[PDB]
């Protein structure tokens, strides 16, 4: 067997710590640090808990590993931006895998994988396609913010890159910050965009061309001498520019004691909804730029299959329009397009180099921890809530959903990536014209303008959606057929878009069975599926997490493992 532990996360200015374990090219385990620590975004940390879980899941120690792989060329970043890489592999391993958690007889081989290559590997090798065009777009790797590459014959060959100062990721983040939604919530900006109108998609900053874009607002070779990426340089340029060209100045954050909460809370001076037009315009600019890049690399490679990864790959709206594009026949974007995925991608790049073949991801992201009935019952008993073990859990949950109840659903291995996919989900009626406001305003406490997304049987997705293909990850939007756009109001957006999950019996028998039962009740085997967490907080992982959230929020029922708890 070849066993490779991929890692992301480092104590110095880092985010999205995660760990993935490949055994013979198959994913044995994969988790995000934030889900285990309950600290959102897994900032500034080696993936200690995620990696400990991976080893425990596979019954392994560090001594059983053929290699440890890290998803950045860290040594090169230290040499370039911080005056040298001070660590021996052994010292680096003591940081990535502290010995108090990871005892070891000796050091496994340590590999650093260039950041965009790791992103690329997480898309290509797990796609089930043997070749295609690679588009990597994020905030910034070691230097570049975009990579165009060719994936073929098991190799990934870089064709071109874009310098960090021209980052589409930084741009989008800075606009997000500017609106008051926050740089850490670009997904909110994506949601806001449909409520607004675009007049000038250049923002007087971008020039567009058939191969991508230009930003004469910033010297493309600008480098921050005081930091190790161009985040701060771009932030200043964008904030100055936006305040100059947009009718509203930056939205400011307000911190004030709230006597009803008994604590200082953070709010915004203006309602971010006010900036909806800027959101629409920023979204259109992003799409325009990426369409160019995508057309370019597809043409240069002679491929019609497109692989996308990097954080900008989380832009499901952009992905859905790329899919629709005349230059694209097939598209694969992994659930872990952000830095969450470079642990997996580093592991894959190394496993391939070591002679393994990588299995397709397979329409599932369920690789985190799962809990047996006994473990769940122990968390249940801890709380002293009454509960049942229904003879047919799936039927009862479907009936609860049909009646307009919101149901927590914590089953099997936790999802990796930012979307709940029927493992750690909050479920509600797709057919209810009030469910959307109820979950936003009452349950998860979100902005009224934020849309929800549906799960549905793959077997009916052709009838429901304007595109007939697998959508296993909720990472692409598409249009709902007019025949259903009115039947499924809670899971449709301002522009008749939806961000669906298609479910196969193979991928998730239980969820599949629940949806089937639901279809017998409401006509369509479709439900609202939002992630099981208070708005803002990390998706719940453990039975105790789920119970804490079930009890803090006005959720009607919780199906956790084989048990059902009702308020």
Ligand X SMILES: Nc1ncnc2c1ncn2[C@@H]1O[C@H](COP(=O)(O)OP(=O)(O)O)[C@@H](O)[C@H]1O
Ligand Y SMILES: NC[C@H]1O[C@H](O[C@H]2[C@H](O)[C@@H](O[C@H]3O[C@H](CO)[C@@H](O)[C@H](N)[C@H]3O)[C@H](N)C[C@@H]2N)[C@H](N)C[C@@H]1O
What counts of helices (H) and strands (E) characterise the chain?
Answer: 18, 23
The DSSP secondary-structure symbol of 267 reads E
Distance CA 80, CA 495 (A): 45
Residue 68 pairs in a beta bridge with: 5, 110
Site for ligand Y in 136-195 (CB under 6 A): 139-140, 173, 183-184
Q: 40 among the known binding-site residues?
A: yes
| Residue 216 annotated in ligand binding | no
Shortest Cβ distance from residue 357 to Fe ion (Å)?
A: 25
10 Å CB burial of residue 186 (0-12, 13-18, 19+) is buried
**In the complex, minimum distance from the CB of residue 46 to Fe ion, in angstroms, rounded to a whole number:** 17
Ligand-binding annotation for 115, yes or no, is yes
Nearer to ligand Y, 92 or 168 (CB): 168
Token pair recorded at residue 182: 């926050």
Measured distance between the N- and C-terminal CA atoms of the chain, rounded to whole angstroms: 48
| 186-225 footprint of Mn ion as x/- string (CB under 5 A) | ----------------------------------------
Check if the beta carbon of residue 319 is closer than 8 Å to that of residue 306: no
Residue 138 near Fe ion by CB under 5 A: yes
- Percent helix, percent strand, percent coil in the chain, to nearest 5: 35, 20, 40
Of the residues 1, 15, 87, 512, only one is catalytic, namely 15
Q: Which is nearer to ligand Y, 143 or 545 (CB)?
A: 143
411 is in an annotated binding site: no
- Give 211 or 224: the residue with its C-beta nearer to ligand Y: 224
111 is catalytic: no
Has 229 been labeled as part of a binding site?
Answer: yes
Distances (CA, A) of 358 to 4, 349, 352: 12, 9, 7
Q: Give the residue at shortest CB distance from ligand Y.
A: 139
| Smallest distance from Fe ion to CB 308, Å | 12
CA distances to 193, 293, 317, 318 from 200, rounded to whole Å, are 14, 20, 19, 18
| Closest CB to Fe ion among residues 320, 345 | 345
Least distance in angstroms from the C-beta of 562 to ligand X: 25
Q: Which of residues 512-551 bind ligand Y (CB under 6 A)?
A: none
Q: Which of 120, 128, 117, 135 is nearest to 325 (CA)?
A: 135
Spell out the SS3 assignment of 358-425.
CCCCCCCCECCCCCCHHHHHHHHHHHCCCCECCCCHHHHHHHHHHCCCCEEEECCCCECCCCCCCCEE
410 with 423: CB under 8 angstroms?
A: yes
What's the CA angle centered on 450, arms 449 and 455, to 5 degrees?
140
Task: Read off the tokens for 46.
Answer: 């080696």
Chain residues that interact with ligand X, rule: CB under 6 A = 16, 138-141, 169-170, 172-173, 186-188, 190-191, 310-312, 314-315, 317, 338-339, 444, 446, 450-451, 453, 477, 493, 497-499, 530-531, 533, 535-536
325 annotated as a binding-site residue = no
Taking the complex as a whole, the smallest distance from the CB of residue 420 to Mn ion amounts, in Å, to: 6
* Contacting residue, 531, 541, 542, 549, with Mn ion by CB under 5 A: 531
Least gap, CB of 217 to ligand X (angstroms): 17
Beta strand pairing call for 305-309 and 330-332: parallel
Encoded one letter per residue, x for contact with Fe ion by CB under 5 A and - for no contact, window 314-353 reads: -------------------------x--------------
How far is residue 349's CA from residue 113's CA, in Å, rounded to a whole number? 8
Site for ligand Y in 12-31 (CB under 6 A): 13, 15
To the question of whether residue 530 is assigned a binding role by annotation, the answer is yes
* Assigned token pair, 422: 């029927």
The answer to whether residues 340 and 41 touch, using CB atoms and an 8 Å cutoff, is no
Distance of closest approach, residue 339 Cβ to Fe ion, in angstroms: 5
CA distance 337 to 123: 8
**Closest approach of Cβ 231 to ligand Y, in Å?**
5
Is 440 assigned a ligand-binding role in the annotation? no
Interacting partner of 231 out of ligand Y, Mn ion, Fe ion, none (Cβ under 5 to 8 A depending on kind): ligand Y
- Residue 491: how many other CB atoms lie within 10 Å: 29
Closest to ligand Y by CB, 140 or 305 = 140
Q: Which is nearer to ligand X, 15 or 513 (CB)?
A: 15
**Binding site residues, as ranges?**
13, 40, 115, 119, 138, 140, 169, 173, 229, 311, 315, 339, 419-420, 450, 499, 529-531
**Binding site residues for ATP, as ranges?**
40, 419, 450
What is the binding site for ligand Y (CB under 6 A)? 13, 15, 139-140, 173, 183-184, 229, 231
What is the binding site for Fe ion (CB under 5 A)? 138, 339
**Binding site residues for carbamoyl phosphate, as ranges?**
419-420, 499, 529-531
Residues marked active site are found at 15
**Binding site residues for carbamoyl adenylate, as ranges?**
140, 169, 173, 311, 315
What is the binding site for Mn ion (CB under 5 A)? 531
């Amino acid at each position: 067997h070849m066993r490779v532990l991929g890692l992301n996360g480092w104590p110095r200015d880092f985010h999205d710590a995660s760990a993935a374990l490949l055994v013979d090219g198959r994913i044995a385990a994969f988790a995000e640090e934030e889900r285990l620590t309950r600290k959102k975004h897994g900032y500034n940390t080696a993936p200690v808990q995620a990696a400990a879980f991976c080893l425990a899941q596979a019954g392994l120690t560090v001594d059983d590993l053929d290699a440890v792989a890290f998803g950045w060329d860290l040594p090169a970043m230290y040499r370039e931006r911080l005056g040298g890489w001070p660590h021996s592999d052994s010292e680096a391993l003591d940081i990535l895998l502290p010995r108090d958690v990871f005892p070891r007889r000796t050091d496994p081989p340590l590999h650093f994988v260039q950041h965009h290559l790791a992103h690329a590997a997480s898309a290509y090798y797990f796609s089930g396609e043997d070749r295609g065009a690679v588009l990597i777009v994020d905030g910034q790797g070691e230097e570049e913010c975009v990579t165009l590459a060719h994936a073929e014959g098991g190799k990934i060959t870089v064709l071109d890159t874009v310098p960090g100062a021209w980052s589409l990721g930084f741009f989008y983040e800075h606009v997000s910050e500017y609106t008051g939604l926050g740089g850490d919530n670009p997904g909110k900006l994506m949601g806001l965009a449909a409520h607004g109108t675009t007049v000038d998609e250049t923002l007087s900053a971008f020039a567009f061309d058939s191969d991508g874009y230009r930003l004469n607002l910033i010297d493309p070779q600008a480098r921050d001498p005081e930091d190790w990426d161009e985040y701060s340089v771009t932030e200043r340029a964008w904030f100055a520019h936006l305040e100059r060209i947009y009718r509203l100045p930056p939205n400011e954050f307000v911190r004030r004691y709230d006597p009803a909460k008994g604590r200082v809370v953070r709010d915004t001076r203006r309602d971010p909804y006010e900036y909806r037009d800027l959101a629409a315009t920023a979204q259109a600019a992003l799409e325009r730029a990426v369409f160019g890049l995508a057309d370019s690399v597809l043409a240069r490679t002679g491929e019609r299959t497109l692989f996308v990864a990097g954080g900008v790959g989380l832009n499901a709206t952009m992905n859905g329009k790329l899919l629709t594009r005349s230059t694209v026949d097939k598209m694969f974007v992994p659930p872990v397009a952000s830095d969450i995925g470079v642990s997996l991608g580093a592991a894959a790049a190394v496993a391939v180099e070591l002679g393994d073949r990588i299995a397709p991801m397979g329409d599932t992201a369920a690789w985190g921890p799962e809990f047996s009935p006994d473990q769940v019952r122990a968390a249940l008993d801890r709380t002293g809530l009454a509960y049942r073990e229904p003879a047919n859990l799936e039927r009862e949950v479907a009936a609860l959903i049909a009646s307009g109840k919101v149901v927590g659903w914590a089953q099997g291995r936790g999802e990796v990536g930012p979307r709940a996919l029927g493992q750690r989900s909050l479920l509600g009626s797709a057919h209810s014209p009030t469910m959307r406001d109820h979950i936003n305003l009452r349950v998860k406490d979100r902005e009224w303008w934020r849309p929800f997304a549906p799960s549905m049987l793959r077997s009916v997705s052709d009838q429901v959606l304007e595109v007939d293909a697998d959508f296993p990850y909720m990472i692409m939007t598409t249009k709902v057929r007019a025949a259903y756009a009115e039947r499924l109001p809670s899971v449709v957006h301002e522009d008749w878009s939806t961000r669906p999950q298609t479910v196969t019996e193979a991928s998730n028998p239980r969820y599949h069975r629940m949806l089937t039962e639901l279809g017998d009740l409401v006509g369509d085997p479709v439900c609202l599926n939002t992630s099981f967490n208070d708005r803002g907080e990390p998706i719940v992982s453990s039975p105790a997490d789920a119970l804490l959230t079930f009890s803090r929020l006005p959720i009607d029922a919780l199906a956790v493992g084989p048990y059902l708890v009702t308020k």
